[PDB]
């Protein structure tokens, strides 16, 4: 499990559950090719997006549909989605956890890259 | 204006208006002595708390009452307040802007220090 | 000044100066058309990007090149850039301040929207 | 395990390891009584601070010594420590995770309160 995503809700103080997201990998034509997708679990986590063999060096984009999440709660959000764009590099550690902390008008994202 | 505090509301995407705060300074006996206090304006800023002459080297605490802010908006939040504790003017006089970004279960605080 | 962007450096506690960014607007064909661009000033702010007449209803993307910022400081950061994507002026004209707080492995973005 | 603390380093994109913290509970005299303490593990987490029987309703303060952490890395921090002050309430969910995301000039803290 080289890539995991964890999403938290700063309004309710809870995991953000059932949040959809799509991952894309940049191709040579400089367009985003679909790579992986899913919805967060009851822990706010999405596991199993890819495998070590499939996740090679490259530029990846994680698009988290935050707008649908807030609309389901009845709170008017600012952003269309939260996007996280990064290069995977083999000199660095093996595992990438992308964390996102969501508020209606604000979000933060942090990468925890470990061995 | 050597010390300014700016407070923002991450739920509404707005300045946080009428937020009370109290500033304290550590005394020689290691107690917190009252220093200055005020409330944020319609811009979410609190200016005029002190002067260059009065704000001497020391350890200062800014206590922002976030709980009353959220309760007035109908929200029961997690934190009693947001505390910011720092040494000031150790190297000579500086201008300090303390920023706080508020959500019911989360907050962030950042210092911008200029010379 | 209907759109302003403010960028801060959480490592140094300073405005993030000379940070490039490009703004795009979604076209009728669902592509991102160039809208405006610039670099932050010594205050970490970028003003004058557009006018009330030019900034019409639409979906906008602000792409802040954080990677070049960190590399110039000797830091190899996680993200390629920080993207902020939002619908603007849906309810009529508003003033938008997009704030970004930068660390090498983490960033936050907040919108302050006033009328 | 009703109370856990998780600390992340936003500069290095890693758990914040060996971070000391002290927890206090407010007494009737309105002073902070020592309650629990420890250092974060290699995962950046501190478990086992208290038990369900001992953690009763009350006002608690978690003081995280962020200054010593940055000083060990050779980066000049702004804050003396990061403080998280909150009321434990039995009407809410059982488990409290206090998360802290650290930068030298900025930190955020979030409570995830779950069942």
Short mmCIF file of C-alpha atoms in Angstrom, two decimals, chain B residues 32 59 61 67 78-87 96 98 105-113, chain D residues 32 59 61 67 78-87 96 98 105-113:
data_model
loop_
_atom_site.label_atom_id
_atom_site.label_comp_id
_atom_site.label_asym_id
_atom_site.label_seq_id
_atom_site.Cartn_x
_atom_site.Cartn_y
_atom_site.Cartn_z
CA UNK B 32 1.00 35.45 34.05
CA UNK B 59 7.31 35.68 27.28
CA UNK B 61 0.54 34.67 25.99
CA UNK B 67 -15.55 29.34 22.61
CA UNK B 78 -14.13 21.74 21.03
CA UNK B 79 -11.61 24.21 22.46
CA UNK B 80 -12.03 26.52 25.44
CA UNK B 81 -9.79 29.07 23.70
CA UNK B 82 -6.77 29.30 21.43
CA UNK B 83 -3.52 30.10 23.25
CA UNK B 84 -0.42 31.51 21.55
CA UNK B 85 2.71 31.60 23.74
CA UNK B 86 5.99 33.08 22.52
CA UNK B 87 9.12 35.01 23.45
CA UNK B 96 4.41 40.71 15.36
CA UNK B 98 -0.50 36.75 15.20
CA UNK B 105 -13.02 21.41 16.09
CA UNK B 106 -9.76 22.85 14.71
CA UNK B 107 -7.66 25.97 14.62
CA UNK B 108 -4.37 27.12 13.22
CA UNK B 109 -2.14 29.95 14.31
CA UNK B 110 0.74 31.58 12.44
CA UNK B 111 3.12 34.38 13.33
CA UNK B 112 4.40 36.89 10.78
CA UNK B 113 7.39 38.73 12.26
CA UNK D 32 -3.53 23.25 36.48
CA UNK D 59 -11.16 20.93 31.65
CA UNK D 61 -4.79 21.22 28.84
CA UNK D 67 10.28 24.49 21.00
CA UNK D 78 8.30 31.03 17.18
CA UNK D 79 6.20 29.37 19.92
CA UNK D 80 7.25 28.30 23.40
CA UNK D 81 4.87 25.35 23.07
CA UNK D 82 1.53 24.41 21.53
CA UNK D 83 -1.36 24.30 23.98
CA UNK D 84 -4.72 22.58 23.52
CA UNK D 85 -7.40 23.40 26.11
CA UNK D 86 -10.79 21.68 26.07
CA UNK D 87 -13.64 20.30 28.17
CA UNK D 96 -10.44 11.93 21.82
CA UNK D 98 -5.72 15.42 19.49
CA UNK D 105 6.19 29.67 12.78
CA UNK D 106 2.78 27.99 12.63
CA UNK D 107 0.80 25.09 14.01
CA UNK D 108 -2.68 23.66 13.68
CA UNK D 109 -4.54 21.42 16.07
CA UNK D 110 -7.66 19.34 15.44
CA UNK D 111 -9.75 17.14 17.69
CA UNK D 112 -11.18 13.96 16.20
CA UNK D 113 -13.85 12.74 18.62
#
